[PDB]
Amino acid sequence: SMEILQVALHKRDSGEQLGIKLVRRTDEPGVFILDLLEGGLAAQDGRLSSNDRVLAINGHDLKYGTPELAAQIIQASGERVNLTIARPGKPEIEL
Question: Which residues lie in coiled coils?
Answer without folding.
Answer: none
